[PDB]
Design a protein around this ligand. Structure first.
Ligand SMILES: [Zn+2]
Ligand SMILES: [Zn+2]
Ligand SMILES: [Zn+2]
Ligand SMILES: [Zn+2]
Ligand SMILES: [Zn+2]
Length: 180
């Protein structure tokens, strides 16, 4: 079972709204949570485990038996804060790659829960940073799309190696290329 790594086109594809709320959505969200705790995250979006659907699991404490298990379906960031902060972002789809991304410090979010009802939430500090990172995945946006041209330069070669690994693994052209 798997984290999808750049340049896999799964990580760029349209993610489909969820209209069906059943045993299946439930059992997939548990799987996602458990990968999240496996890999010590605060948030995990569906495209990262290979399903192109607008589903995210979140635990703002990001540890077992702490925080709350929040399930966000069809989420929408309504508002972004106006204060920007720089933070060293990583991403499981780019193993070992970390680099400065500047982003809004807080956000507010409408989404839908596991049975189908709408809730909203405001986020700040690490939770907001992580939520924005994973929300981007739902919108087919990767963290390097957010980096300055200076900062990307520092990771271009490490992204090229991921490109080459993809071409090795799956004998085809990397479908996207940082050199773009
Ligand atoms: Zn669990
Ligand atoms: Zn931890
Ligand atoms: Zn992630
Ligand atoms: Zn990521
Ligand atoms: Zn090159």
């Amino acid at each position: 079972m798997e984290i999808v790594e750049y340049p896999d086109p799964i990580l760029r594809a349209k993610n489909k709204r969820i209209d069906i709320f059943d045993e299946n959505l439930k059992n997939l969200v548990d799987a996602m949570f458990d990968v999240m705790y496996k890999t010590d995250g605060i948030g995990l979006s569906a495209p990262q485990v290979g399903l192109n659907v607008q589903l995210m699991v979140f635990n703002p404490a990001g540890e077992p038996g702490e925080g709350k298990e929040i399930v966000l379906v069809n989420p929408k960031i309504k508002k972004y804060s106006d204060k920007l902060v720089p933070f060293d972002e990583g991403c499981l789809s780019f193993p070992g790659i970390y680099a400065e991304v500047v982003r809004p410090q807080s956000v507010k979010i409408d989404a839908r829960d596991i049975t189908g009802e709408r809730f909203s939430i405001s986020l700040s500090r690490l939770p907001a940073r992580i939520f924005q990172h994973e929300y981007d995945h739902l919108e087919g946006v990767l963290f390097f799309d957010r980096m300055t041209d200076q900062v990307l330069d520092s990771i271009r070669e490490e992204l090229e190696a991921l490109e080459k690994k993809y071409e090795e693994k799956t004998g085809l052209p990397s479908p996207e290329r940082v050199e773009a």
